[PDB]
Every structure is written in structure tokens, then in C-alpha cells.
Design a protein around this ligand. Structure first.
Ligand SMILES: Nc1nc2c(ncn2[C@@H]2O[C@H](COP(=O)(O)OP(=O)(O)OP(=O)(O)O)[C@@H](O)[C@H]2O)c(=O)[nH]1
Ligand SMILES: Nc1nc2c(ncn2[C@@H]2O[C@H](COP(=O)(O)OP(=O)(O)O)[C@@H](O)[C@H]2O)c(=O)[nH]1
Ligand SMILES: [Mg+2]
Lengths: 244, 439, 95, 50, 50, 186, 430
């Protein structure tokens, strides 16, 4: 590390005249004499947008000791996992919440495995996805608490894929909106006022405002009759999509 | 044989109605019991009370007023008050549940169970009259029940009666001092409602009257009673031409033909002079010229607006006392020669003047002193767009995050009625800026 | 300078001269019930007493307030402000 | 905050903490050139710590 | 503050104002987080969230 | 400003394919956002506005006031994507008499009335992209019984993806429309 | 007209009510025998709000006392003003809950609550027009925390349009009297946020601090604490019973204080408060009243208001005053402390006036402030709850009655969710 020599840094324009003791504010009470400006406490800003200090993941502690059947294959240009045993014989109840929990991870290859495995499990599953909804709530809200843009975007993509994955799931999800939505209230309006010029972010869906609006309209499309009333109770500024 | 019917709705409406109906009773010499005294007559002429009262056939008189509210506190207070024998026992309509500053509640939920009885009472009262001039209506605009019931009443009356004149005396929220926190919403909604339903509207915000009381009357702790008394005096000065002989009388229908250039622009602001206490009222001339100058300095506007920021469309103003047309004309010429006051291009002459002989009365225990000459002025000027701008800003600040919207949408009102009022107010401001440009 | 009545008990909406006249013509503002002299030689004529038994053995102990607050006079503002004619004549002044 | 971001935090807001520290001050000895506001209060801290 | 001012060849008033300005570290501390490690010599004083 | 300029078959005011598609348009945004993105329904870049409080978010046809954008032409037409949200637009027109009158058109309004300065009209919007044609001639002639001389101003409010705004001058079908004007179906 | 019934449960609730009814009866001039002996006419105009008339001309409160242990009513019987209550409304268990929320909500409350619900139904249908319900309870005791919340759920599912007030005593970590406080506090708040229309939090630690350093009295007790709480309760609803310049009932307060449905937890304060010896010297005017109102020390909660920004404020004045003073003082306060008030709602303080003051005062003030300072209460209680629950300590007593840890996890999750959402609006800017 470096630092200037501190006793040498100096000011030039200021004059070197020194008042000494001789001063005295007594006997010269002009009405224009200065007073203090007393110290003022700064405006409290709290930590609403501060980072979450991501908690410890379950995926790492399962994989390091190796009890999940997953195979990293490097034949493809990008790694594509192949299954030691097939997902349909795999029990979703024990495994799937772990894969959901693994999303919080950032260090390779744990993050890679977690998200890609969630995609393949959701795509493969047909009906067994339905009963496992109640316990999936903990990983998803824990991840959404991270207040990190990358993890949040990945998790919203997860939610889209989960809802579109199989029928009957949206209305089953209706009671659980209360605890999963309110993070969306933070980031509904976080979109860039780039103005006239071109936006290049359509390639990499980092526009979290567009992602959040897309997810919300998908939830309302798939949910059912009470989906709108739940959304409006949860987030105020929502506007209906199914209602003309 | 000319009659006018008064409607009071909301707590502010009832409290201003008490103040005004004291004033008219004192002006006509009627005791609180409603009986004119057999001895000690003070008022010459006949049929003069007929504009506001109806003879019972033998003795006492019935005011041509109706009182409406959903919270029975103020109405019960009136019925136990000293004026209980004055009004009809069954024209003081009291509900059971208050709107609680919720415009949706008073427009869709609980007012509809009272409006039927209200309009029945209005029909019963209007059947008696023969030369019905119109209706006066009083309602604070920043209150749920007042705004909602007033809007519904105006909407029903517009289709029940057609072309009858209706005058709304609204008390808009002050730019910075206000009692509630939600009142911009209901003020905008009610303004949208009455803009297409009321012939004439008067601005009477509180802060300006507070400042007038502080400067002129030397009042350091004013309360609501003083404001109500001042508004009552303004009403009396406005309507004295219908019941007192005058050199150049002005009818209520002499307004929709003099003041409003276009159907959309019918909000006007008032001023009154002189306002002075007896301890220093008699030391000066009270000359007609200086009182009409007092009517026009921006300091004595009854609404918190600056006339110097805009042009004038019209000024209709009435003297009561011993004024003369020569002095009125001499003062008007001076006002025109004055440079700080400018009129719109397409209005060469913009003054309508009324003269009435009856000097204003004084209420014992009040604040004002007794003088001969008084002037009450009503102005329509371009400067009033600023209050709409400020309330619009206050409105969209909260409507950006959709605050308080559930407390309205949960009671029958859809989501989209706020935006209609918003765009209507934007259209109003565009209309003002359109009219204000020179040709 | 200092018209006595105004500041302690906030006087309600009325003319400044009216309030001054009222709070000047009202009683008190003078006369000694205790008969203490302004010099201070008479200080021990009157013992300084404040006319309940505080007891913390079981409950309470807060004690009520001093006798400088209103009773029976609780009465409505519209009533007090709104009377018809039974007042002083505003402009009588017999000549 | 390594005691230097504190320096930045107090220097960035003059209205919140107004005082003589916000600007440079002359030295009582003419042999010493007046010191820049940031460094002078470092030197104050070093002296007080010693 | 007199010996400190003598050592720094600087004003007693300005050094006192400097101390009073710095001693408002409580304002920084009240806000959440903002860990502080003040050394200024022999003692290392660390403060975490609270 | 489009005055003393030859104008025969069409007049395109705003067109989302260019370096700066809005040279003359003025933008005022309080809580919204404006950007052009390639569209999934039509594989092309489309300028786009959203926000809350549709009243405050708007773009005006002339850059600054006090000047006349007057359009020679009778038939307005826009290409609009339906977002199933609020949407308003207004046009200011000059009639036979030297009067400037205003037509406001709203998605969320349910009643229409005539006033000397403003005439509001509701719309019903179909799903997806659509072409909407504003005659404006029958509108002035029916509401005001007065012919129109010039088209002063055009204003579009929030919550829309806008492809083209132009003047067609007569009922034209897709065959008559030039390739760049017609909308190629997905 | 527009009446509200009173329901109290638990030891703390019964102690609060036993003084609340004394204060109300003294205000209305009712003797402990129930025979009117007052002096003013206004004392009986709207007396029907809290009292029912009985043959023989006596009056009875419409209050229902509920508990799982009989000693509480067997004690409140003997106190002053205790004879007013109907013997029939009293409902009690024979075992007790033992500060166990599971017992007080699942295994004993479900069995007992039938009779108390029937009685509440009877009282509700008896009155001419219901305004709502008000309940006083503490969140540190199991029987109160379970009974009260299940009763709120039962009443809400039956009266969707009526209003509910809950005066909740919240446990502070400094002065702790029960080792199980965090568990039942979190479990109670989880259900309370969903149903209560208004919640009004009170802290024993703050009560001790105020009665010590404001009152300057040597030895306060629960009688004094209950007296302060009673004055605070009466101030809120006084204007509903007495005429005023700007009458502002409970529904008006609910509309004007709650921006969004889940933010209905309030801190309160009462003014003026002076020592016995220094009462002679203070000059009672609205500047002093407002400066004592907005002072951080006067709040009934350990929350420090200047650590956060107010969402809304409300002041109810009692006495005779000019409205110019009230509104210009409120404007001055909002202008001077502009940093501590949220900026995207303008003029965020409501005022109301009633002309009938409390007995023994010229003029008084009750303050209710919806502020973002209550997040720290939740953070501390959540920290204690998670510290104790990480080791599964004190858990088998709850799990023995069919309740499992998933409910605890959901309660903690929703609790932190409320914390996060409630601090969300603190940082919002236009
Ligand atoms: N000029 C004047 N205005 C008043 C008076 N009383 C209330 N207001 C105004 O009325 C507004 C609120 O409405 P209120 O009159 O208090 O009551 P309301 O109109 O019946 O509506 P609710 O309170 O819902 O019953 C306030 O913002 C005041 O500005 C008064 O005595 N004089
Ligand atoms: N204000 C007040 N609080 C009390 C009183 N007695 C107990 N408390 C508080 O109530 C808490 C215990 O509540 P508890 O009696 O267990 O409630 P319960 O289980 O419903 O009976 C303690 O933390 C006390 O601080 C009282 O007389 N007055
Ligand atoms: Mg009211």
C-alpha cells in the first residue's frame, strides 16, 4: 500500500499571518458577528439496499462428500451434465429442495451444477412436482433475500420455468404469494431511464424491471381468480393483465 | 316572490350554516324562536324575508334551509342548541355512520341511503316556492362525506331540475396548512364531479382568511367562528340585492351572464372590505375610493392566490351603503389607470357594479364594527391556475406509489376514476393557459 | 408591555382590545388573601401548605393534579360563541 | 473504515460538521508552511496518539 | 489541547474544534454496519455493527 | 415545420428505425422510462414508453411551445402494440373559424361528451399489434359541425410500444401501402 | 350511537381494564354503585357508547373478562369500581396455560372459547349500531397471547366490516420477566398482523423511564403504569363521546394513519406530564404541549423516533383552543424537522380538537405516530428468538401439543419479511 508523506502536504494561497493571543470578542458585539452552525445528525438511510451476507449453502456440503448423482461432461463446448441415474427414478422430494438451495452458491462448479440441475429436473418432471411445493418456499425466499442482482435474476428465471413447467401448479402456489412477493416491491421500478439511445441488454436479461414485470404477468396468467387480488394486496402499484 | 334554497352538507357546511343563519335572523329582526316580536319592530317593508323564509300563516317563520350529515354529533348539537324551535324538526337529516374522510364511502356506500330522503325534502321545499331563483350549497371540499354527498346531490339535481341555478361555496385546502392527509384525493375527485355540474363556484381557503383576521382585525388566536362570520357577511352582501332596494340591482341570474366567459371557467375568488375593529374603525374616512383600493390590493384576497401573477377576465362587485354612481365611476377609472393591474386583451370593459342601500348589519359579540360603506368583490382571473397546479402536484406525489388507493377501491370505486379526474384537471389548466394568451 | 391575562390561559378568538379589557376588568390580579407583605418581613406569618396521603404499600401513588383546572364549566364552543342578543349592547354608551 | 474513510466522511460534508478544521490554517511558526486540511488533522491525530 | 497545539505548531482553538469534530463518530456508528478500526498508535479499537 | 412543404400521399412524423427517431419530439418523464428494444412479436426494434401515472409521462410532437406544427393532412394513423394497460393520446386541430380545439382519446374512459375545447372519446383495443386510423374529419364535422383546416399537435402518453406514426390521407389497404409503411406479419 | 364493546383477557389485560374502567367512570361521573351523580349535562348524552342501562336506573360496562385461571377475576372483584361488571360475562378456565402459547391457543382455548364467543355475539347483537371492538392484552404471557389472537381471528371472520383495536404490551429485552417471551411474542405477532386493524404497542421499560425521569416520583408501580395507559386509551376515543371542532372517530384515524394494509403498528404518547412540585410553574400552552409531545423521551415505547423517519403523525387535543395555534405549531414542527419526515407524502400530520378536557386539566394532548422506528423492536425480538431456537431449547413443551417447528419457521420468516418490507418505505425517494 501507499500514502503521501503527510507532514509535507501543504496549502500555499492561505497567508502565514497568525493572530496570536490578541483577539477578543468582548466589547465588539456587532449584530453581524458569526455564530456556530451546530452539528446536525445526517439523514438516516438504513440498509434496505445493502448486501445480505449470503448464508451457507447445502449444495456444497452434499456435493463435497458426494451423494448426489450428477456427472460433469466436457464433450460439449459448454459443460452439459449427464445423469448417473435417471431423473424420473430420482426422488424429487429429497433432492429438488437441495438443488433449489444450491442457487445461492457462486463458486464453481457448485453454482453451475445447481442451476443447470434445477433446469433439467423441472423440465423432466411431469406431475411429481406438484406435492413438493410447500417445502420449496424456504430456498426461494432465502435466495431472494440476497439482494444480489445476478442471483435475483437467476431465481426469477427459475420461477418462470417452474410455473410454465406443469399445469395445476399456479393455483396451488396462490397461498404462498405472501412471503415470496414482497421482495418484488423493492425492485419493481428499478429500470434504467436510458432515454433515446439503443439498449443492448435484450441479449442478457439483466433488466430486472422487465424480468419482474414478465414474471408477475406470468403468475397472474397461470394462477387463477384470486391471483389478482393477492397481487394487488401484496404490491400496490400492480395493474391487471387478464382484466381488459 | 323570489326564493332560493340553501343546502348545507358536511361539518364545515353545518358550522357555516349556523353562523350565516344567525346573521340573516338578526338582519330581519326575527327572534331565535322564529317569532317576529309584536313590539319593537326594526325592519320596514314586507316579503323581504320571503327570499329565505316562508310564513307559517300565523306568527313564526321557517327557514328555507336543509342540513345534511352522516355523523349525528353536529346535528344533535344544533337540535339541542338555542335555535331548536327555528328549523323544522324533520329537515335536519342525520345518518349513523360517517364517511371517515373517504369520498368513495360517501359517494357509493352510505350516502345513497340518505340521498333519496334528501331529494324528497328538496321536492317538498321547492313545491312551496313560486319564483325559485336557485340553490346555494355549502360543503368543505377536503372532507369525505361533504364532498361525496355534494357531488351526488349536484348530479341528481342537474337532471331533476335542468336549468336552475346552483352556487357552490367551496373551502379548498390551503397550500401548506391542512388538517388531514388524504384530502387532495377527494378534493380532486369532487372538483372533477362539480366542474360539469355547478354553475358558479367560490374559492374560500382557510389560510387567507386567517391572515386577514391577523392583519386587519388584530386577532392573534382566531378560530372557526370568526371565519364563519366573515363568510356569512360575504353571503349577505352578495344576496342583499334580492331583498333590499338598490340603485342598480343585481340578480343571481345576473352572474351566469356576466362572469363566466366560457362554460368551463366558473371558479371565482372573493374579497371584502372594510374589515376593521371598532377600536380604530372610526378614526378614518372610510371613503369609497380607499375602500375599493382595499378591495383590490393582493393582500386582502380571500383565497391564497396572487392576482399579480395573471390577467383578469371579469370583476363583479357590489357596494352597500351610501355610495354614489359618480364616486363608483371615479374609483373605477382610477383602478383602470393603475398599471399593476392588467386585464385580458379581449375584454375592454370588465367591471360589473352593484349598488345597494342597506348597510351591513353587525352581530353582537362579533368582531366587525358598524360602518356605512362596504364592498364585496368577486373576480374571475387567470391567476387561479396555480392552486390547481399545487393540488395536482400534491396528488401525483402520493399517487405515484398508489398510496391510500385501497381505502377507496375497497368500497365500490374502480381503479380508473382517479386518472379521469387527473386528465380533466390537466385539461382545465390547458384551458386556462389557452384563454390567457393574447390574440 | 405585558397585559397580564393573555399568556397563561390562552384566550380564544376575540379582539385584542376586547381580551385586554376583559382580563384587566376581571377580578384577582391584586388583593392579598394570604396578606403577605412584599418586603419579606412577614414571611413566617403564613406557613407554606399545599392542600392526599400518598401510600406505596400496595398500589398507585400518582396523586391527582393541583386545583388550577376547570370543572362544571365544561361547555360547548358553539354554545359559548353562538348566543343571540342577550349580551351587552355593542354600541350603547348612554349620553 | 480504516480511520481514513472517516477523514473523507467528515470532510465531504462541511454543512453537517462546520468548523475550523474544514479549511487550512496558518501555523504559529513562520518557518512552517500552512498545511492542507486533510493532512493537518492526520498530524493532530498522530500527536494526540503519541 | 495546548501541548498538542504546541507540538503541531498550530492553534489551540483549531485543534480543539478538530477534536470536537472527530468525536462525532457516534453519528457514523449509529448507522448500521460501518465497522471502525481506529489505531492512532498503541491501542487498536475495533467496533462491529454494534 | 412541415408547412410550405409538399405533402401528397403520406407523412411520417415518428419512425422508430433511425439514429434518433425523435428529432422534433420533446420528452418529459417523471417516473417512467423510454427505450427502443427489438420486439418478440415483430422482429424489429420498437421505441417504447412505460411508467406510472400515465398523465405525467408523455412526449410532445413539437420540441417547444409557441410554434405551429400544423399538418396539411386529414387522416392520422398509428401502429400500436396492445399492452393491456392504460393509454391515452390527444390531437389539437384548427377548424374553419380561428379556433384551436382538442380531441382526447382514452383507453380507460367509458363516457363521451362534447365541450367547446375538449372532446374525450374511449377506445377498445384488440390483442397484440394493431393499426389504428383516426379519421378526424367526421369527428370535427359531427361534434362541431365545422370543417378542419390544420392539425396542430399530436401527443402520446405512457404504456405503449410505438412503431410508426404517420398520415395516410385516405383509406388505403395493404396493397396500396408501401412496403416500409405496411406492417409485416410475424 | 356507534358503540364499541370491550374485551380483556390475561392478567395484564385485566389489570389494564380494571383501571381503564375506573378512569372512564370518573370521567363520566358514575359512582361504583352505578348511580349517576355528575354535574354536567354532556356527561350523559353519549354515555351509551360504553354503558348499558338496566332497570333501576343503573349503568353497566359492556366489557367481557376472559382468562384461563380464576384468580384474576377473583382478585379484580375486590378492587374499587369492580362491582360494575356483570357476573355473567366473566369466563374462566380451571387449569391455566402456564405461559404456554400452544396450550393457550390449541388444547384449552379451543375448548373454552365457545362460551366467550357466544357472550361476545350476544353483546354485539344487543347494541343498536356497532363501530368495532377494542382489546387490551400482553404479548409476554401464553394465555393472553393465544386466547387474544384466536379471538381476533374468530371475531374478524364474523365481522369483516368492523374495526379492531389491540393495545399490545410488547416484551423488551432489558426488563425481562419471562424466559419464554420471544417464542410466544413472535407466534402472536404472526397472527396479529393479518387480522388486527390497529395495534398500539406499549413498553414497560419505557413506562419506567418516563415515570422516573419525567414525573420525578420516587416509587412508581403497576397502578401508576395502568393509570398512564388508561389516560392514553381514553384520549384516543374521547372525541367520539364528546363534541368538537373537528370530530375524528376511529375509522377516520384508521383511514388517515395507515398508508398500506400491513403497516398498522403504532407508538403513542400523552401530554402534559409534570412532577407534583413543578406543576405550579409550567405555563400550559400549545408550544409547550407540542414540544413535549414530539420529544423522543415522551414516547410510550423504547423505540427511538429520531433513528427513523415518520410515515404519519396524529395529534388529538382536548380542551378549548384556537385552531390557528394548532395548525401553525404543526407546520412549524414539520418545517423544523424536515429530515425526519418522509418526503413523498406532503403535510403528513393530522390534527383533531375536542372541547371537553380531561378532569383535572385545562388542556391535554394524545399523540399517535406511525413511524419507521418500530423495526428495531422486531430486530431484537427476532434475534433473541433465533438465538434460542437455534438450539431447540424450551421446545418440547410446545411440541407436546401437536404443534411442530414448521410453524415456528414460518412465523420467523413472515416476521423478518414484515421487517424488510417495513424498512423498504424508509429509503424510498421520489
Ligand atoms: N372554513 C372552515 N372549514 C372547516 C371548518 N371545519 C372543518 N373545515 C374543513 O373541513 C375539512 C374536513 O371536513 P370536515 O368539515 O371537518 O368534516 P366533513 O366535511 O363532514 O367530512 P368528514 O370528516 O368525513 O365527516 C377540513 O380540511 C377543514 O379545512 C370550519 O369550521 N370552517
Ligand atoms: N401494565 C401492567 N403490566 C403488567 C401487570 N402485571 C404484569 N404485567 C406485564 O405482563 C407480563 C406478563 O404477562 P402475563 O401475566 O403472563 O399475561 P397472561 O399470561 O395473559 O396472564 C409481564 O412482563 C409484565 O411486565 C400490570 O399490573 N400492569
Ligand atoms: Mg366531518
Amino acid at each position: 500500500q501507499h500514502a503521501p508523506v503527510f507532514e509535507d502536504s501543504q496549502a500555499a494561497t492561505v497567508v502565514n499571518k497568525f493572530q496570536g493571543l490578541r483577539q477578543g470578542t468582548g466589547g465588539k458585539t456587532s449584530t453581524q458577528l458569526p455564530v456556530k452552525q451546530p452539528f446536525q445528525a445526517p439523514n438516516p438511510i438504513c440498509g434496505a439496499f445493502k448486501k445480505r451476507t449470503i448464508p451457507v449453502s447445502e449444495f456444497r456440503r452434499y456435493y463435497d462428500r458426494g451423494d448426489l448423482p450428477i456427472k460433469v461432461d466436457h464433450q460439449g463446448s459448454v459443460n452439459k451434465i449427464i445423469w448417473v441415474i435417471q431423473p424420473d427414478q430420482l426422488d424429487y422430494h429429497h433432492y429438488l429442495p437441495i438443488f433449489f438451495d444450491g442457487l445461492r452458491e457462486k463458486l464453481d462448479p457448485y453454482r453451475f451444477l445447481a442451476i443447470l440441475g434445477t433446469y433439467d429436473l423441472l423440465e423432466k418432471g411431469s406431475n411429481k412436482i406438484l406435492p413438493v411445493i410447500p417445502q420449496l418456499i424456504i430456498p426461494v425466499k432465502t435466495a431472494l433475500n440476497t439482494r444480489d442482482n445476478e442471483i435475483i435474476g437467476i431465481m426469477l428465471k427459475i420461477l418462470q420455468r417452474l410455473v410454465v413447467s406443469g399445469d395445476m401448479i399456479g393455483e396451488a402456489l396462490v397461498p404462498y404469494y405472501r412471503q415470496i412477493l414482497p421482495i418484488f416491491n423493492l425492485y419493481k421500478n428499478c429500470n434504467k431511464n436510458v432515454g433515446d439511445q439503443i439498449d443492448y441488454g435484450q441479449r442478457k436479461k439483466l433488466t430486472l424491471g422487465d424480468l419482474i414485470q414478465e414474471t408477475l404477468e406470468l403468475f397472474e396468467q397461470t394462477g387463477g381468480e384470486d391471483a389478482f387480488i393477492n397481487i394487488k394486496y401484496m404490491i400496490p402499484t400492480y395493474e391487471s393483465c387478464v382484466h381488459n | 316572490m323570489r326564493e332560493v334554497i340553501s343546502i348545507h352538507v358536511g361539518q364545515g357546511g353545518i358550522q357555516v350554516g349556523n353562523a350565516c343563519w344567525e346573521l340573516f335572523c338578526l338582519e330581519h329582526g326575527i327572534q331565535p324562536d322564529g317569532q317576529m316580536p309584536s313590539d319593537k319592530t326594526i325592519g320596514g317593508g314586507d316579503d323581504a324575508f320571503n327570499t329565505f323564509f316562508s310564513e307559517t300563516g300565523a306568527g313564526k317563520h321557517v327557514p328555507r334551509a336543509v342540513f345534511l350529515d352522516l355523523e349525528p354529533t353536529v346535528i344533535d348539537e344544533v337540535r339541542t342548541g338555542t335555535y331548536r324551535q327555528l328549523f323544522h324538526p324533520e329537515q335536519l337529516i342525520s345518518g349513523k355512520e360517517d364517511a371517515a374522510n373517504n369520498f368513495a364511502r360517501g359517494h357509493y356506500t352510505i350516502g345513497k341511503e340518505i340521498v333519496d330522503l334528501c331529494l324528497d325534502r328538496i321536492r317538498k321545499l321547492a313545491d312551496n316556492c313560486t319564483g325559485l331563483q336557485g340553490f346555494l350549497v355549502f360543503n368543505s371540499v377536503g372532507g369525505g362525506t361533504g364532498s361525496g354527498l355534494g357531488s351526488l346531490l349536484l348530479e341528481r339535481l342537474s337532471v331533476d331540475y335542468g336549468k336552475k341555478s346552483k352556487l357552490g361555496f367551496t373551502i379548498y385546502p390551503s397550500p401548506q396548512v391542512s388538517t388531514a392527509v388524504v384530502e387532495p384525493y377527494n378534493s380532486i375527485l369532487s372538483t372533477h364531479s362539480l366542474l360539469e355540474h355547478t354553475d358558479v363556484a367560490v374559492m374560500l381557503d382557510n389560510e387567507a382568511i386567517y391572515d386577514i383576521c391577523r392583519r386587519n382585525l388584530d386577532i392573534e388566536r382566531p378560530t372557526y367562528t370568526n371565519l364563519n362570520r366573515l363568510i356569512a357577511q360575504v353571503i349577505s352582501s352578495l344576496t342583499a340585492s334580492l331583498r333590499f332596494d338598490g340603485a342598480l340591482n343585481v340578480d343571481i341570474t345576473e352572474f351566469q351572464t356576466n362572469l363566466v366567459p366560457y362554460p368551463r371557467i366558473h371558479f371565482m375568488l372573493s374579497s371584502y372590505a372594510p374589515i376593521i375593529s371598532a377600536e380604530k374603525a372610526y378614526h378614518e374616512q372610510l371613503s369609497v375610493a380607499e375602500i375599493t383600493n382595499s378591495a383590490f390590493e393582493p393582500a386582502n384576497m380571500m383565497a391564497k392566490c396572487d392576482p399579480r401573477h395573471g390577467k383578469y377576465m371579469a370583476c363583479s362587485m357590489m357596494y352597500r351603503g351610501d355610495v354614489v354612481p359618480k364616486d363608483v365611476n371615479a374609483s373605477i377609472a382610477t383602478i383602470k389607470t393603475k398599471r399593476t393591474i392588467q386585464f385580458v386583451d379581449w375584454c375592454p370593459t370588465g367591471f360589473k357594479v352593484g349598488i345597494n342601500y342597506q348597510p351591513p348589519t353587525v352581530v353582537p359579540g362579533g368582531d366587525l364594527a358598524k360602518v356605512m360603506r362596504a364592498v364585496c368583490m368577486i373576480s374571475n382571473s387567470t391567476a387561479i391556475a396555480e392552486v390547481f397546479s399545487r393540488l395536482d402536484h400534491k396528488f401525483d406525489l402520493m399517487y405515484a406509489k398508489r398510496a391510500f388507493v385501497h381505502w377507496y377501491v375497497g368500497e365500490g370505486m374502480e381503479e380508473g376514476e382517479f386518472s379521469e379526474a387527473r386528465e380533466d384537471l390537466a385539461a382545465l389548466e390547458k384551458d386556462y393557459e389557452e384563454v390567457g394568451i393574447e390574440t | 408591555g405585558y397585559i397580564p391575562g393573555l399568556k397563561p390561559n390562552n384566550h380564544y378568538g376575540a379582539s385584542y382590545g376586547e381580551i385586554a379589557k376583559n382580563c384587566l376588568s376581571n377580578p384577582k390580579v391584586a388583593q392579598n388573601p394570604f396578606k403577605l407583605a412584599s418586603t419579606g418581613f412577614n414571611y413566617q406569618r403564613h406557613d407554606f401548605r399545599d392542600p392526599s396521603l400518598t401510600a406505596t404499600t400496595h398500589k398507585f401513588g400518582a396523586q391527582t393534579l393541583l386545583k388550577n383546572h376547570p370543572s362544571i364549566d365544561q361547555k360547548s364552543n358553539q354554545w359559548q360563541s353562538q348566543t343571540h342578543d342577550s349580551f351587552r349592547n355593542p354600541l350603547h354608551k348612554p349620553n | 473504515m480504516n480511520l481514513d474513510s472517516i477523514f473523507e466522511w467528515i470532510l465531504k460534508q462541511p454543512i453537517n460538521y462546520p468548523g475550523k478544521h474544514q479549511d487550512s490554517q496558518p501555523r504559529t511558526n513562520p518557518a512552517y508552511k500552512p498545511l492542507e486540511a486533510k493532512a493537518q488533522f492526520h498530524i493532530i491525530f498522530k500527536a494526540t496518539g503519541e | 489541547a495546548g501541548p498538542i497545539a504546541a507540538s503541531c505548531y498550530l492553534g489551540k482553538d483549531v485543534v480543539s474544534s478538530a477534536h470536537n469534530a472527530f468525536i462525532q463518530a457516534v453519528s457514523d456508528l449509529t448507522t448500521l454496519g460501518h465497522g471502525l478500526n481506529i489505531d492512532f498508535g498503541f491501542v487498536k479499537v475495533y467496533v462491529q455493527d454494534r | 415545420m412541415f408547412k410550405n412543404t409538399f405533402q401528397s400521399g403520406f407523412l411520417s412524423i415518428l419512425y422508430s428505425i433511425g439514429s434518433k427517431p425523435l428529432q422534433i419530439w420533446d420528452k418529459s418523464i417523471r417516473n417512467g422510462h423510454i427505450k427502443r428494444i427489438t420486439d418478440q412479436d415483430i422482429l424489429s426494434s420498437v421505441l417504447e414508453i412505460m411508467g406510472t401515472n400515465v398523465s405525467t409521462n408523455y412526449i410532445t410532437a413539437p420540441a417547444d411551445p409557441k410554434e405551429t406544427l400544423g399538418i396539411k393532412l386529414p387522416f392520422l394513423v398509428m401502429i400500436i402494440k396492445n399492452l393491456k394497460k392504460y393509454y391515452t393520446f390527444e390531437v389539437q386541430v384548427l377548424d374553419d373559424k380561428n379556433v384551436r380545439r382538442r380531441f382526447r382519446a382514452s383507453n380507460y374512459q367509458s363516457t363521451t361528451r362534447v365541450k367547446p375545447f375538449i372532446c374525450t372519446m374511449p377506445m377498445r383495443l384488440d390483442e397484440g399489434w394493431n393499426q389504428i386510423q383516426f379519421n378526424l374529419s367526421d369527428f370535427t364535422r359531427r361534434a362541431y359541425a365545422t370543417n378542419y383546416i390544420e392539425t396542430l399537435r399530436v401527443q402520446i402518453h405512457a404504456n405503449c410500444r410505438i412503431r410508426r406514426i404517420y398520415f395516410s390521407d385516405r383509406l388505403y389497404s395493404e396493397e396500396e401501402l408501401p412496403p416500409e409503411f405496411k406492417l409485416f406479419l410475424p | 350511537m356507534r358503540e364499541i364493546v370491550h374485551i380483556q383477557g390475561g392478567q395484564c389485560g385485566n389489570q389494564i381494564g380494571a383501571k381503564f374502567w375506573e378512569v372512564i367512570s370518573d370521567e363520566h361521573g358514575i359512582d361504583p354503585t352505578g348511580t349517576y351523580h355528575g354535574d354536567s349535562d354532556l356527561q350523559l348524552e353519549r354515555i351509551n357508547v360504553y354503558y348499558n342501562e338496566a332497570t333501576g336506573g343503573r349503568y353497566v360496562p359492556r366489557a367481557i373478562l376472559m382468562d384461563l385461571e380464576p384468580g384474576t377475576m377473583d382478585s379484580v372483584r375486590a378492587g374499587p369500581f369492580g362491582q360494575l361488571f356483570r357476573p355473567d360475562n366473566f369466563v374462566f378456565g380451571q387449569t391455566g396455560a402456564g405461559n404456554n402459547w400452544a396450550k393457550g391457543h390449541y388444547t384449552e382455548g379451543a375448548e373454552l372459547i365457545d362460551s366467550v364467543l357466544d357472550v361476545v355475539r350476544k353483546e354485539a347483537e344487543g347494541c343498536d349500531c356497532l363501530q368495532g371492538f377494542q382489546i387490551t392484552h400482553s404479548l409476554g404471557g401464553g394465555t393472553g397471547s393465544g386466547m387474544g389472537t384466536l379471538l381476533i381471528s374468530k371475531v374478524r371472520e364474523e365481522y369483516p366490516d368492523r374495526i379492531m383495536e389491540t393495545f399490545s404490551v410488547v416484551p423488551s429485552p432489558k426488563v425481562s420477566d419471562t424466559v419464554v417471551e420471544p417464542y410466544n411474542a413472535t407466534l402472536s405477532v404472526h397472527q396479529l398482523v393479518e387480522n388486527a386493524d390497529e395495534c398500539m404497542v406499549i413498553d414497560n421499560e419505557a413506562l419506567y423511564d418516563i415515570c422516573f425521569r419525567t414525573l420525578k416520583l420516587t416509587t412508581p408501580t403497576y397502578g401508576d403504569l395502568n393509570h398512564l395507559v388508561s389516560a392514553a386509551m381514553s384520549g384516543v376515543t374521547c372525541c367520539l363521546r364528546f363534541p368538537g371542532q373537528l370530530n375524528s372517530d376511529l375509522r377516520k384515524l384508521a383511514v388517515n394513519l395507515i398508508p398500506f394494509p400491513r403497516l398498522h403498528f403504532f407508538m403513542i404518547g400523552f401530554a402534559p406530564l409534570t412532577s407534583r412540585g413543578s406543576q405550579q410553574y409550567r405555563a400550559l400552552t400549545v408550544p409547550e404541549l407540542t414540544q413535549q409531545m414530539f420529544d423522543a423521551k415522551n414516547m410510550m415505547c423504547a423505540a427511538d423516533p429520531r433513528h427513523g423517519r415518520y410515515l404519519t403523525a396524529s395529534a388529538l387535543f382536548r380542551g378549548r383552543m384556537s385552531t390557528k395555534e394548532v395548525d401553525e405549531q404543526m407546520l412549524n414542527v414539520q418545517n423544523k424537522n424536515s429530515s425526519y419526515f418522509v418526503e413523498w407524502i406532503p403535510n403528513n400530520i393530522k390534527s383533531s380538537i375536542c372541547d371537553i378536557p380531561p378532569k383535572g386539566l385545562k388542556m391535554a394532548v394524545t399523540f399517535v405516530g406511525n413511524s419507521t422506528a418500530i423495526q428495531e423492536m422486531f430486530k431484537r425480538v427476532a434475534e433473541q428468538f433465533t438465538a434460542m431456537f437455534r438450539r431447540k431449547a424450551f421446545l418440547h413443551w410446545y411440541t407436546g401439543e401437536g404443534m411442530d417447528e414448521m410453524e415456528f419457521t414460518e412465523a420467523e420468516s413472515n416476521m423478518n419479511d414484515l421487517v424488510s418490507e417495513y424498512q423498504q418505505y424508509q429509503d424510498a425517494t421520489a
